[PDB]
Amino acid sequence: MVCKLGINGFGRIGRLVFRAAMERGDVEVLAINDPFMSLDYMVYLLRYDSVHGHYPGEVSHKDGKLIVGGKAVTVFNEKEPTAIPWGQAGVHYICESTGIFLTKEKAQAHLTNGAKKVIMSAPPKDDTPMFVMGVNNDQYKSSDVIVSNASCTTNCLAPLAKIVHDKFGIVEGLMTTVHAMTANQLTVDGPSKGGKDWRAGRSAGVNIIPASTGAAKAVGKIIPSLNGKLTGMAFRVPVPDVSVVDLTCKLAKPAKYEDIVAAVKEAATSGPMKGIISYTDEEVVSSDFVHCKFSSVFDINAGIMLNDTFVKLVSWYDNEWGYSNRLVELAHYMSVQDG
Amino acid sequence: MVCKLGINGFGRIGRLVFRAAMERGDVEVLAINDPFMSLDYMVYLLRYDSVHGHYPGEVSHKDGKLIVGGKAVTVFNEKEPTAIPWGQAGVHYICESTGIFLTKEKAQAHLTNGAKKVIMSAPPKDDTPMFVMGVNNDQYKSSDVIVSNASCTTNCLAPLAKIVHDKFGIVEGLMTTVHAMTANQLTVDGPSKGGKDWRAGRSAGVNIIPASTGAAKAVGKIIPSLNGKLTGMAFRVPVPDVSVVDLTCKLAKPAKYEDIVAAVKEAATSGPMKGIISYTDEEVVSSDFVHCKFSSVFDINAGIMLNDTFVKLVSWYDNEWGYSNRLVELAHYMSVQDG
Numbered sequence: 001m002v003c004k005l006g007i008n009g010f011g012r013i014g015r016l017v018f019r020a021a022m023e024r025g026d027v028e029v030l031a032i033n034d035p036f037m038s039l040d041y042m043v044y045l046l047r048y049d050s051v052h053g054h055y056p057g058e059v060s061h062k063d064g065k066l067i068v069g070g071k072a073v074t075v076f077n078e079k080e081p082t083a084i085p086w087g088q089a090g091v092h093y094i095c096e097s098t099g100i101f102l103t104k105e106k107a108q109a110h111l112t113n114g115a116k117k118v119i120m121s122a123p124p125k126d127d128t129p130m131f132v133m134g135v136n137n138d139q140y141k142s143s144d145v146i147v148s149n150a151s152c153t154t155n156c157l158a159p160l161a162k163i164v165h166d167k168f169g170i171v172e173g174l175m176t177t178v179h180a181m182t183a184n185q186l187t188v189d190g191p192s193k194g195g196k197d198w199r200a201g202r203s204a205g206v207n208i209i210p211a212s213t214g215a216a217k218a219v220g221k222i223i224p225s226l227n228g229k230l231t232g233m234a235f236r237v238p239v240p241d242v243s244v245v246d247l248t249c250k251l252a253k254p255a256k257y258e259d260i261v262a263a264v265k266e267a268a269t270s271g272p273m274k275g276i277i278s279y280t281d282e283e284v285v286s287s288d289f290v291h292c293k294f295s296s297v298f299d300i301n302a303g304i305m306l307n308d309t310f311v312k313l314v315s316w317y318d319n320e321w322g323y324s325n326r327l328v329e330l331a332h333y334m335s336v337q338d339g
Numbered sequence: 340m341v342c343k344l345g346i347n348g349f350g351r352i353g354r355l356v357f358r359a360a361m362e363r364g365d366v367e368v369l370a371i372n373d374p375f376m377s378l379d380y381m382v383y384l385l386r387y388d389s390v391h392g393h394y395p396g397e398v399s400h401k402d403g404k405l406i407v408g409g410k411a412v413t414v415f416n417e418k419e420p421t422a423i424p425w426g427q428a429g430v431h432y433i434c435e436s437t438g439i440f441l442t443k444e445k446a447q448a449h450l451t452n453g454a455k456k457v458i459m460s461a462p463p464k465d466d467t468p469m470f471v472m473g474v475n476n477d478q479y480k481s482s483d484v485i486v487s488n489a490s491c492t493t494n495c496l497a498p499l500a501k502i503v504h505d506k507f508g509i510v511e512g513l514m515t516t517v518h519a520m521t522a523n524q525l526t527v528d529g530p531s532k533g534g535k536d537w538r539a540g541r542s543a544g545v546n547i548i549p550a551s552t553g554a555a556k557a558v559g560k561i562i563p564s565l566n567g568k569l570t571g572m573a574f575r576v577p578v579p580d581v582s583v584v585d586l587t588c589k590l591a592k593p594a595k596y597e598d599i600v601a602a603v604k605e606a607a608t609s610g611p612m613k614g615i616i617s618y619t620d621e622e623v624v625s626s627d628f629v630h631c632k633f634s635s636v637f638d639i640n641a642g643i644m645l646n647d648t649f650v651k652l653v654s655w656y657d658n659e660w661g662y663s664n665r666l667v668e669l670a671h672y673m674s675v676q677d678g
């Protein structure tokens with residue numbers, strides 16, 4: 001209809017969600033909030049991107065508002081969610097892309113002056129429900145006031161896992177994501193914030209860096225029958241964007257590799273994963289997915305079967321752009337369902 | 340009692356095999372052949388290294404010979420192996436590290452004028468026997484005139500595979516190696532030599548690049564009971580050296596993770612894999628293994644078990660330095676057994 005969107009935290013995800021939203025005819029961005037940047041600064045970070053190129057349209061400001069392609073967007077600079085007048089901007093759905101309000105109690109604070117619902121741009125730290133478009137978004141209810149769009153990796157893996165589990169049955173699986181660098185990593189060796197994850201504090205540009213991830217386990221929440229049947233981990237490597245899922249799983253039913261390819265192709269061509277999952281049989285590398293909108297691109301030639309029940313599947317994802325498009329689509333999906 | 344070594348192809352492996360041979364009194368490098376570098380250029384490439392630091396010692400040349408650590412080394416610049424006078428230079432064992440002579444018929448060209456044996460610094464294209472020190476080098480026979488030291492990845496995987504297979508049994512496994520950049524890759528997008536590996540010719544510094552590899556299947560040759568039970572693939576990523584094995588396997592006997600750790604520690608501490616396999620429980624990243632001599636360093640904290648028979652195990656390797664040490668160790672072992 002028109003999804004009336006607001007964005008909290010104008011970072012990689014906030015700015016790309018903004019761009020995706022601007023591209024859609026059925027979503028409008030009515031407000032932005034980020035206290036670590038002025039208007040001139042926002043204009044700059046929106047104009048230029050080291051990965052996704054120049055903003056496709058003129059960006060400026062006037063009378064305290066951001067002006068993008070003729071449209072005015074209201075701007076706030078509040079540290080604390082409760083102090084953001086979203087209702088006065090007419091915002092309904094909030095993209096919560098700061099990375100630090102990942103509980104219901106915290107995200108709730110956005111909803112006391114007129115806004116309707118919050119979509120977390122990360123997996124929740126509590127039992128907030130996660131949705132992955134094309135996999136379980138039909139489970140959303142209009143009483144789900146706070147929701148999460150999961151992670152980039154979960155959006156890559158869940159669609160592939162659904163197809164394989166539905167057609168052949170996954171007995172058990174272990175996942176690795178070889179993942180692009182992110183904002184929480186450091187340029188040179190130093191202390192990670194909170195002292196959480198020491199490996200993340202080591203020079204990003206010159207290291208392969210192991211990392212924990214709940215993303216495969218999270219597929220167990222998206223696809224309940226796989227709870228306890230999937231987990232995994234990550235290696236962070238020196239590229240600025242684009243990642244790849246490497247899923248090793250045992251199948252319940254024997255398959256030729258061509259049967260798995262056909263099932264993916266079928267899911268990509270029509271039904272709920274059209275525009276979500278895709279495939280390639282070409283000799284692709286990660287830069288080939290810069291600014292690719294899909295959640296998951298199955299790499300036909302990269303995968304390998306040991307035998308007819310034990311297989312290693314490969315699927316690409318632009319962790320930044322794919323995820324940001326899914327989040328906007330989830331916001332729009334909720335807006336339609338809510339009436 | 341000295342292994343008289345020659346080096347064909349003075350590359351990453353050639354020059355590091357040279358360093359390793361210089362750190363032991365029971366191996367001498369008597370001659371080097373590389374037709375793509377003058378004597379002056381050889382001195383330069385040996386002096387300086389982007390990953391392993393300056394050569395530790397004076398390098399010069401005099402009367403047509405490379406002069407290192409007081410010793411004189413004979414230098415040739417021949418493209419055709421049959422033109423290299425190994426015999427006259429006093430060479431017995433040849434480190435064949437050019438990348439292009441990986442069949443018996445081709446490697447035999449080194450043995451026409453007085454040399455005894457050739458060691459391929461890569462897996463062969465034919466049925467040439469492969470050996471991994473600490474795993475199956477005792478299968479070596481003095482009649483094996485042409486042999487291979489396998490690959491860096493096989494040297495990292497085989498020791499780990501042996502330990503897990505002997506202690507718990509490997510029903511099946513699939514391996515990924517996240518691998519440092521190599522000389523066969525290109526700096527910017529272009530055509531790979533022979534038009535073979537298209538992905539490998541894509542800009543190395545800005546891509547995660549899938550690659551095929553027989554390194555896991557080769558473990559089935561090193562450890563015959565695992566023939567047909569292991570394979571895998573690789574992703575080449577933008578680091579200059581150091582790689583890591585990610586092995587997903589199904590065990591025959593149930594195990595707690597601590598049992599796998601204990602098994603690896605025992606093998607690292609005494610017996611045939613002392614000096615071959617090691618372990619860490621620290622928050623390491625790839626650069627911590629630059630100039631690490633081990634074939635395989637088990638990363639205790641990076642591993643993850645889904646359940647008591649399905650596990651993902653992680654092991655680091657300095658693909659240049661670990662491998663180069665193993666090759667020299669293999670050449671020496673051969674010289675001793677040959678008498």
Ligand SMILES: NC(=O)c1ccc[n+]([C@@H]2O[C@H](COP(=O)([O-])OP(=O)(O)OC[C@H]3O[C@@H](n4cnc5c(N)ncnc54)[C@H](O)[C@@H]3O)[C@@H](O)[C@H]2O)c1
Pocket residue numbers: 008009010011012013014033034035036037078079080097098099100121122151152182183184319320323
């Ligand atoms: N590939 C990806 O980059 C990716 C994919 C999926 C999910 N995510 C998740 O999305 C979230 C944001 O990630 P990102 O990559 O955009 O990080 P980022 O560092 O680029 O964005 C963070 C932004 O939030 C702003 N911010 C900080 N405190 C704020 C506050 N109190 N109020 C309002 N704004 C505030 C910062 O100024 C910054 O602009 C994280 O939870 C991350 O894990 C990232």
Ligand SMILES: NC(=O)c1ccc[n+]([C@@H]2O[C@H](COP(=O)([O-])OP(=O)(O)OC[C@H]3O[C@@H](n4cnc5c(N)ncnc54)[C@H](O)[C@@H]3O)[C@@H](O)[C@H]2O)c1
Pocket residue numbers: 347348349350351352353372373374375376417418419436437438439460461490491521522523658659662
């Ligand atoms: N991580 C590694 O670099 C690594 C690890 C294990 C095995 N290997 C294998 O070892 C071999 C060498 O690898 P590298 O990384 O040292 O490659 P490299 O390109 O650094 O070295 C190859 C050298 O051989 C020389 N050469 C080319 N043609 C020759 C000829 N006709 N006669 C003599 N020399 C010639 C080149 O000038 C070059 O110096 C390859 O088979 C490779 O797969 C490499």
Ligand code: NA
Pocket residue numbers: 021022023024025026027028029
């Ligand atoms: Na729009």
Ligand code: NA
Pocket residue numbers: 360361362363364365366367368
């Ligand atoms: Na020596």
